[PDB]
Amino acid sequence: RAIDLSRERDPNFFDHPGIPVPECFWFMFKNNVRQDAGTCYSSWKMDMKVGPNWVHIKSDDNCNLSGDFPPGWIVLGKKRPGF
Amino acid sequence: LKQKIVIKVAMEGNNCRSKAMALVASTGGVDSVALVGDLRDKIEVVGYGIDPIKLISALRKKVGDAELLQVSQAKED
Secondary structure (H helix, E strand, O other): OOOOHHHOOOOOOOOOOOOOOOOEEEEEEEOOEEEEEEEEOOOEEEEEEEOOEEEEEEEOOOOOEEOOOOOOEEEEEEEOOOO | OOEEEEEEEOOOOHHHHHHHHHHHHOOOOEEEEEEEOOOOOEEEEEEOOOOHHHHHHHHHHHOOOEEEEEEEEOOOO
């Protein structure tokens, strides 16, 4: 079943006061089952533990995420409202 | 840049979450701390020159088993 990002509830997040507001939501899946979600910057990168492996996740200007995800896992991005 | 560090902490209830957050907020160079994640089991820390291995050590001894889950830099254009 194609992961349906339109039916994913918002992450539980906090916009930290001393840094820019990040433009993206991310959602982490194992076997197409949501594991967690959060915020990240657009046109940027982050190191995240995805199950058994650290992954260097890149974001494009529209919050599309890419990385070398371990088998069975993926992290998908969406632009936040207003961004 | 500022760093953002996310740590998963074994935290039994809302008071243990309170205590892990108090411990982190007291740490050298922490600008801001929040409890995040679908299960409200992740501590997100933002600051300049935070020592993530010192921070994990402190949590492991005083609060609960802890796993580092994210390290990133704050984007400044």
